[PDB]
Scaffold this active site. Structure first.
Site, mmCIF file in Angstrom:
data_model
loop_
_atom_site.group_PDB
_atom_site.id
_atom_site.type_symbol
_atom_site.label_atom_id
_atom_site.label_comp_id
_atom_site.label_asym_id
_atom_site.label_seq_id
_atom_site.Cartn_x
_atom_site.Cartn_y
_atom_site.Cartn_z
ATOM 1 N N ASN A 63 -9.807 -3.127 2.865
ATOM 2 C CA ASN A 63 -9.671 -3.117 1.291
ATOM 3 C C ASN A 63 -11.058 -3.031 0.812
ATOM 4 O O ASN A 63 -11.962 -2.968 1.321
ATOM 5 C CB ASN A 63 -9.009 -4.522 0.987
ATOM 6 C CG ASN A 63 -7.527 -4.617 1.118
ATOM 7 O OD1 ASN A 63 -6.949 -4.009 1.728
ATOM 8 N ND2 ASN A 63 -7.164 -5.813 1.005
ATOM 9 N N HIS A 88 0.874 -1.283 0.103
ATOM 10 C CA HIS A 88 -0.073 0.169 -0.150
ATOM 11 C C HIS A 88 0.858 1.162 -0.029
ATOM 12 O O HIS A 88 0.412 2.302 0.424
ATOM 13 C CB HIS A 88 -1.041 -0.165 1.128
ATOM 14 C CG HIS A 88 -1.965 -1.165 0.999
ATOM 15 N ND1 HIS A 88 -2.975 -1.456 0.169
ATOM 16 C CD2 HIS A 88 -1.918 -2.527 1.631
ATOM 17 C CE1 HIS A 88 -3.262 -2.797 0.073
ATOM 18 N NE2 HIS A 88 -2.815 -3.335 1.082
HETATM 19 C C1 HEM Z 1 -7.379 -8.810 5.397
HETATM 20 C C2 HEM Z 1 -6.134 -8.763 4.880
HETATM 21 C C3 HEM Z 1 -5.410 -7.372 4.815
HETATM 22 C C4 HEM Z 1 -5.981 -6.142 4.351
HETATM 23 C C5 HEM Z 1 -7.544 -5.677 4.312
HETATM 24 C C6 HEM Z 1 -4.878 -4.937 4.965
HETATM 25 C C7 HEM Z 1 -5.035 -3.908 4.526
HETATM 26 C C8 HEM Z 1 -3.788 -3.027 4.692
HETATM 27 C C9 HEM Z 1 -3.936 -1.581 4.378
HETATM 28 C C10 HEM Z 1 -5.281 -0.643 3.863
HETATM 29 C C11 HEM Z 1 -2.571 -0.891 4.643
HETATM 30 C C12 HEM Z 1 -2.069 0.528 4.590
HETATM 31 C C13 HEM Z 1 -3.003 1.354 5.350
HETATM 32 C C14 HEM Z 1 -2.388 2.714 5.127
HETATM 33 O O1 HEM Z 1 -3.243 3.371 4.180
HETATM 34 O O2 HEM Z 1 -1.212 3.460 5.648
HETATM 35 C C15 HEM Z 1 -1.845 -1.990 4.967
HETATM 36 C C16 HEM Z 1 -0.386 -1.779 5.475
HETATM 37 C C17 HEM Z 1 0.502 -2.968 5.988
HETATM 38 N N1 HEM Z 1 0.002 -4.312 5.984
HETATM 39 FE FE1 HEM Z 1 -1.941 -4.987 5.717
HETATM 40 N N2 HEM Z 1 -3.758 -5.938 5.039
HETATM 41 C C18 HEM Z 1 -4.188 -7.074 5.128
HETATM 42 C C19 HEM Z 1 -3.239 -8.285 5.561
HETATM 43 C C20 HEM Z 1 -1.767 -8.091 6.135
HETATM 44 C C21 HEM Z 1 -1.148 -9.321 6.562
HETATM 45 C C22 HEM Z 1 -1.396 -10.718 6.663
HETATM 46 C C23 HEM Z 1 0.406 -8.637 6.829
HETATM 47 C C24 HEM Z 1 1.517 -9.241 7.379
HETATM 48 C C25 HEM Z 1 1.625 -10.236 8.244
HETATM 49 C C26 HEM Z 1 0.137 -7.150 6.694
HETATM 50 C C27 HEM Z 1 1.289 -6.231 6.682
HETATM 51 C C28 HEM Z 1 1.058 -4.814 6.405
HETATM 52 C C29 HEM Z 1 2.336 -3.863 6.462
HETATM 53 C C30 HEM Z 1 3.565 -4.432 6.971
HETATM 54 C C31 HEM Z 1 1.976 -2.587 5.955
HETATM 55 C C32 HEM Z 1 2.632 -1.324 6.040
HETATM 56 C C33 HEM Z 1 2.048 -0.762 7.344
HETATM 57 C C34 HEM Z 1 2.423 0.544 7.481
HETATM 58 O O3 HEM Z 1 3.573 0.740 6.972
HETATM 59 O O4 HEM Z 1 1.915 1.067 8.330
HETATM 60 N N3 HEM Z 1 -1.126 -6.808 5.908
HETATM 61 N N4 HEM Z 1 -2.462 -3.265 5.004
#
Ligand code: HEM
Ligand code: HEM
Ligand code: CA
Ligand code: CA
Ligand code: CA
Lengths: 674, 672, 356
Positions: free
Chosen positions: B135, B62
């Site tokens: 999402n 993202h």
């Molecule tokens: C249901 C599944 C998931 C959805 C809907 C989801 C949604 C998101 C969204 C919307 C962001 C960006 C938030 C922003 O705008 O700054 C994000 C960032 C992130 N996500 Fe998730 N995600 C999911 C699963 C995962 C999983 C399973 C992991 C790791 C175990 C993960 C690790 C991360 C990391 C490392 C970032 C960057 C966060 C940051 O730098 O602040 N995501 N994801």
């Protein structure tokens, strides 16, 4: 090359980073539908690594691509420089080069209009030497302290971060019009040099005057010029825009593919060499980075061949992590008092702390030298060395006085050119010798062909038309008018303003060789150029024609793509994924004529749009087989057109078509202002 | 507000260093007028050091995204279903920040990549920050968080050459999908119009996981979050999305910025499906499985409140780039479930913020601050911005009288884990067999799309899989698609010249579900903000008059009007040179401009006609106001969503209907 | 305290640098090193590092950025933010400016000025300006440290350099380490002295407020605690910091003998009701009360017995009743008046042996 550091995972069981065999597909849970446990170290080690994968992108030149190669000296250059890598005919030094756009972030498109970076590391037997250059020989600004002003203005507006990888917004043109030094680089960027056909089809320039220094202490002033052996070529703007969307990776894929096919790109590494006494002899100051030395004043001397022939193994570890510095200098080379260069020396050493997150970035494999390191630098985060010398201070007796000091007279030390001096007040003042911002931009403009001049005018019309401020637009016309009244008038017509009255203070009629792309004649080689053959699965004879054409074209090292409705033996790409930006020339086999005069398998009119786009963008186009009028009539392409081919004979078709590929662009298809 | 206090005004004043000393920053200090630069020039070094350190690591996923401020307003006192404070009174307002994003691309990649999209909402509530990190698609690719780096490595660029950017159209992605069949449901969503939404405003937001609502009495229910767009659902077509990616990489962030600036801030109804704990396995799948939706026919939506975005950021880096969401930012009244994808996420976000911020005090950035007092014994760390008065930061203490006090179900409105939750069984690294059906819901989804929508999805797959070089991977892809729908596998196999495997009906069925189709969701509820391009000419006073007449009408109805001509002048917004069909939702040619559609140095050859033809081919409402134009463009006068009127008012009325319909899908060829 | 980040680059209009090559390089170091400490470029935003006046510049972003900047055109020169912030220099905006008379001339060189070459005359000036006992302490610190150097070559090299400052210093040090001093080399010897560098020669302290008086007493005699209370009152009246020490804590006793040490006091007084302690207990190490007194005396502090009976304590300590900085009075008032003169004198340097 970096073999010692490679890790092979073609066999074996998964392990942690500490060599314990583990699994990594299912979390440890309190029961089959239970919560995950904190004790799951397999999960946490893998996710922690993933969470920390990213490092800050480069502050500029974030978007780019690199390859390994070799530099080979053409001579013993001892008579002009003490530089070890240039000290013998045929002497070879490993290199790594990274090319880039300049303004865009990581993941922005390769085919943005922009300055391009061209950075070269020579891993010399006397230390790493970097030349960190651009594809344009002059820079926007005359003092390093102004770089954040320039870069802030060019980069997206900081409230909404719009627009990506583009000078086409108010802040950029506000800066350009308020800081007239920018005119020369601006004109280069608005020419075809702002949209090169590939990294292999552009030159590299050090920009600054540097010094060559002999062992005897005498020096000369030099400019670096890496001259492409592939020739010079550009895209047209309206192709570059489509390509930005269809293939953001166009330039990095072009480079990667050329190396993999054994067509590794080559440059002659050249210098202009002039005496110290000539610093102000040419009607400008050699310390001014907004100026070129016309080749009519000092001809290029070829020092050696640079060839890139090996792609990286891991992009992050090699291309992303390479950290260039103009302060990576070797005995035999020295700096000059160019105030832009002077400040760069500080910036690169500092910024690598940001990227690496610690001071030991020279120990990364790609940054290591190929000769031993002997110094008293110690500790710091990420320290990989285990130093045996327990008395890391000078002067010492407890390590017998080692390491010994290297200088002009002992141990082949770097030394500052001993004829250099300074005199005067300590001042924050610009030299009046830097004050002519307009004559060289005009010299450049004068040196382009008529169609080239129109393209530059049109690039300016496009960008300035998107500037919202009426005041900024007027200011821009004021500056353009000082370079050329005709430019100002022609640009003004697009934006519904009056150009101001001619001001001939800086107008002149002089021209200089080597800066025009259109004027540099047909390409010296057509190997790697891309031919799309439009065909159909509906006629087995269309496929037969396509196969015969392929054999004959691949013989001469062209990269051939056969396009049809669906994939099958002999077809590379479907119409759905094909686009004119994918080809340097387009051929339709006459067996496929019916596709040109609806399908769920591709968008409506796609086969014809490929042909029409290619024609409109100046590419060689044609029909092979004898029946050409159905296709040419549908496309509204004249059979008698230059760069339009129609032959029944495959051999005769290819012979003519290959001449068109070397001409590269048919510039008579573009309208000119009267 | 923490952001008000930290706003810095530079509209007046002399330049100073960061320590308030007036300085200059335009010329370096040198030994003589043509001399070398001095190390003692602190003005130079402080400015260049700052610039040298401006960048921070992009988000691991993202990375490409944009944000806005707004408010959430509760519709009711929801105490009957949750203890959550922000939901405890009719009319209760809570400030929000939302960031939308693509998922795979790096921070400079195009908005209109085909991808899953992020929709992350922070509610700065009076009992703490609460984040819903969702999402635009309700189901995710994988069933266990430990697989995330495998998914992400496969879809991101190949690591030898970092090709291709922001795209699943390469071998590794399809290899992963074909080897890990849980991916099928999300893949189908991503290959539909949901992968290429018309804007952030025209997509929904989903929490994906089942969560819990917890009442003060300790009872709990299972919930799904659904943010339902008040702007309606809309998508691009693929060829349009491709051209847009080059013409305007910033299309979605600009669309959002502009809507807010014009007083058309986007709105969602924040909704939940709510079911009993006893229904965790009652619907034919496991509610712990993030690859499944609950069909709306089984649990209807309840509307809790209105989410409205109505203020743009002041500084993008400080607010949008630095906002740091966490599903662990939870409040009393909400709890987690044992969803193994959710479970692992809880760890990831707290850890990754250390990478981005470069220090542990990231919650002190103004955008991450809460709007209530902070009382804890967290101390020190790089970038510590507080000066803590309590010199006995340990519990239990007497020297600070026992403060801060513990908060729990019965003290200080503390968070508490739903007290009905239990665990029992072996400590195992095993997948529940209840998770094993990877194919029925992809089929449910596909069945629920319209015929043209199903064709668009087949065509997306045909596009991507045709770009996969490995014959083995392509064969494996057909094996998995075939388990979803034999028809899909046959049609995509056609494009790649392979034969589809024989039908395997194990997971086939004919069931459909409401609310998942874009095309089937009817005309848009509003056409405010939609973009109309008027193609005109500077060579006819009448053409410019016609354009102006249309403009006053359409603008009063909320439409964004761009008059295009050869050159700029009074009443003309864009030149033909910079205009493209991707820039409009509808295109109108004024009669007086007919000549342009039959060469000029002011725009590329055939540009005017090309804009009109592209718009028509992409399904948009197109029209002429004032037959030859429709002839040159090969556009049928009697075509659905083709308009032809002498009457200005009549034209605007018909055309405005066309903008609501949005896409005229009869213009797209279907397999048969 | 931990986060404060100083820089000689934090300079203001009215002050400028010189071409001291040590100073010149410090200007680089401090700005750079704060990146290491803070882990990010925004360290000037830490509260302790913030200025107390407005900041107007185009510095942006960076990890830990706390500001929300309203100016969306952060470049110079601009029209879109009306040319602000404006440049500050000698003539406008009270800008910093480099001293305009400053110049440079000559080759660009990595060479030391020959005017820097005398390394020895000023060390000798400094040594000459210290009192005899002060010179002894300096010789003794050198004897202490150089005696711990294992390399005989290094020790020889040290005597070579010290010998160039003072043959006498080299001789006296050499004696401690069993080596011979090199022959006198008088190039840089002289007899000049300078004011204001001597500690011992700087006369008595201008104030004794905050100086620490330990009163050694006992819980075994109610009379000792009474003397300690009266002395405390009289000393505290003059802003001295009083600690009463006894075997155990109780009202009016601050510290136990177990925790007490002569290093904790600027002067030590025994109350004569406590005299028996100065002749074993599980409550402190054997001989502790007497050792506090003896250490205090040995380290040159004012020491005394208050109450009238002093010979038992003083004899046990081997401290002469008539020594300078040794006090014995019955009257609390008279005792304190004399003792306070000793606290201002601070150190009784006649208690230290000198080289002959
Ligand atoms: C249901 C599944 C998931 C959805 C809907 C989801 C949604 C998101 C969204 C919307 C962001 C960006 C938030 C922003 O705008 O700054 C994000 C960032 C992130 N996500 Fe998730 N995600 C999911 C699963 C995962 C999983 C399973 C992991 C790791 C175990 C993960 C690790 C991360 C990391 C490392 C970032 C960057 C966060 C940051 O730098 O602040 N995501 N994801
Ligand atoms: C003659 C004008 C200049 C040229 C030709 C030039 C060239 C380049 C190139 C080619 C790169 C990318 C190297 C790579 O591929 O990794 C680069 C990076 C950089 N440049 Fe320069 N540059 C110029 C002026 C400056 C100035 C005046 C400054 C600041 C004082 C500057 C600061 C930087 C920084 C901070 C980076 C990122 C470096 C890194 O992360 O390794 N550039 N520049
Ligand atoms: Ca702007
Ligand atoms: Ca760090
Ligand atoms: Ca791949």
């Amino acid at each position: 090359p970096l073999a010692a550091y490679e890790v092979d995972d073609s066999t074996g069981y998964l392990t942690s980073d500490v060599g314990g065999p583990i699994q990594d597909q299912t979390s440890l849970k309190a029961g089959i539908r239970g919560p995950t446990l904190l004790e799951d170290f397999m999960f946490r080690q893998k996710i922690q690594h993933f969470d920390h994968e990213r490092v800050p992108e480069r502050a500029v030149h974030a978007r780019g691509a690199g390859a390994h190669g070799t530099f080979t000296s053409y001579a013993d250059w001892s008579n002009i420089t003490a530089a070890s890598f240039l000290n013998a005919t045929g002497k070879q030094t490993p290199v790594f080069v990274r090319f880039s756009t300049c303004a865009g972030s990581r993941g922005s498109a390769d085919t943005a209009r922009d300055v391009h970076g061209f950075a070269t590391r020579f891993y010399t037997d006397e230390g790493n030497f970097d030349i960190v250059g651009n594809n344009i020989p002059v820079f926007f600004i005359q003092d390093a302290i102004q770089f954040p002003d320039l870069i802030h203005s060019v980069k997206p507006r900081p409230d909404n971060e719009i627009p990506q990888a583009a000078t086409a917004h108010d802040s950029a043109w506000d800066f350009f019009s308020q800081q007239p030094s920018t005119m020369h680089t601006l004109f280069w960027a608005m020419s075809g040099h702002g949209i090169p056909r590939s990294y292999r089809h552009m030159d590299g320039f050090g920009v600054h005057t540097f010094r060559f220094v002999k062992d005897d202490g005498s020096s000369k002033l030099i400019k670096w010029h890496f001259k492409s052996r592939q020739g010079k070529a550009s895209l047209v703007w309206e192709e570059a825009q489509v390509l930005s969307g269809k293939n953001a990776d166009f330039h990095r894929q072009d480079l990667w593919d050329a190396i993999e096919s054994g067509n590794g790109p080559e440059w002659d590494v050249c210098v202009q060499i002039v005496d110290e006494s000539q610093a102000q002899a040419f009607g400008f100051d050699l310390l001014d980075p907004t100026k070129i030395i016309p080749e009519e004043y000092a001809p290029l001397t070829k020092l050696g061949l640079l060839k890139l022939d090996r792609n990286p193994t891991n992009y992050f570890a090699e291309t992303e992590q390479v950290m260039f510095q103009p302060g990576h200098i070797v005995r035999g080379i020295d700096f000059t008092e160019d105030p832009l260069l002077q400040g760069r020396l500080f910036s690169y050493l500092d910024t690598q702390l940001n990227r690496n997150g610690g001071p030991n970035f020279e120990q990364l494999p790609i940054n290591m030298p190929r000769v031993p390191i002997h110094n008293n630098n110690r500790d710091g985060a990420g320290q990989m060395f285990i130093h045996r010398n327990k008395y890391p201070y000078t002067p010492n007796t407890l390590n017998s006085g080692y390491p010994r000091q290297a200088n002009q007279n002992a141990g082949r030390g770097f030394f500052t050119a001993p004829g250099r001096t300074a005199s005067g007040a300590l001042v924050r003042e610009v030299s009046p010798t830097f004050n002519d911002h307009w004559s060289q931009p005009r010299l450049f403009f004068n040196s382009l062909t008529p169609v080239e001049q129109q393209f530059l005018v049109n690039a300016m019309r496009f960008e300035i038309s998107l500037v919202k401020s009426e005041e900024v637009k007027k200011n821009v016309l004021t500056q353009l008018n000082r370079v050329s009244h005709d430019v100002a008038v022609r640009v003004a017509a697009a934006i519904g303003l009056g150009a101001p009255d001619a001001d001939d203070t800086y107008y002149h009629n002089n021209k200089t060789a080597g800066v025009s792309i259109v004027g540099s004649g047909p390409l010296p080689t057509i190997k790697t150029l891309r031919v799309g053959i439009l065909a159909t699965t509906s006629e087995s004879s269309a496929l037969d024609q396509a196969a015969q054409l392929r054999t004959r074209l691949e013989k001469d090292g062209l990269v051939v793509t056969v396009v049809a409705e669906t994939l099958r033996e002999g077809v590379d790409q479907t119409y759905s994924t094909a686009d004119a930006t994918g080809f340097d020339g387009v051929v339709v086999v006459d067996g496929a004529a019916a596709l040109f005069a609806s399908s769920p398998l591709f968008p409506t009119g796609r086969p014809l749009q490929i042909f029409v786009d290619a024609y409109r963008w100046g590419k060689p186009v044609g029909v092979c087989g004898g029946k050409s009028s159905e296709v040419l009539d549908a496309a509204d392409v004249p059979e008698d057109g230059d760069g339009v081919y129609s032959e029944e004979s495959v051999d005769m078709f290819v012979e003519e078509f290959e001449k068109g590929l070397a001409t590269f662009r048919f510039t008579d298809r573009f309208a000119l202002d009267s």
